[PDB]
């Protein structure tokens with residue numbers, strides 16, 4: 001089995017919104033907004049909920065742009081992350097207990113201070129190409145295996 005997660009990227013013509021995760025798993029890396037999908041909500045509802053909780057933002061429409069499956073060695077559940085994009089947003093991004101939001105120019109994405117997988121899949125995100133990814137990690141720093149392909153349906 002796998003555990004459902006959400007990841008949301010606010011991608012505008014000249015900038016992308018990321019949040020510095022301040023506590024919990026992966027703290028100290030810039031990341032999209034998201035987390036675990038709960039019982040009683042759709043995946044898209046969970047994505048909106050996490051975006052709202054972490055940044056204060058609401059959105060008209062989220063678009064499905066990818067799926068990334070993560071294996072962490074020694075962890076029995078695969079993590080099935082559903083990736084979403086939006087261009088337009090409602091509200092001003094504000095800091096939460098979990099996340100400190102900042103806009104980045106598309107040529108200044110801080111990949112060295114992001115999850116290592118992002119280097120591989122972000123360019124597909126920026127090109128508006130839908131994708132399926134798989135990454136096996138040993139801890140939080142080392143990618144042992146991975147696959148990445150473009151898909152017609154996410």
Ligand SMILES: Oc1ncc(Cc2ccccc2)c(O)n1
Pocket residue numbers: 005007025026031032070079081115117118
């Ligand atoms: O972009 C990006 N890549 C990897 C992670 C780590 C992760 C955490 C929870 C479930 C799956 C993966 C992440 O949070 N963000």
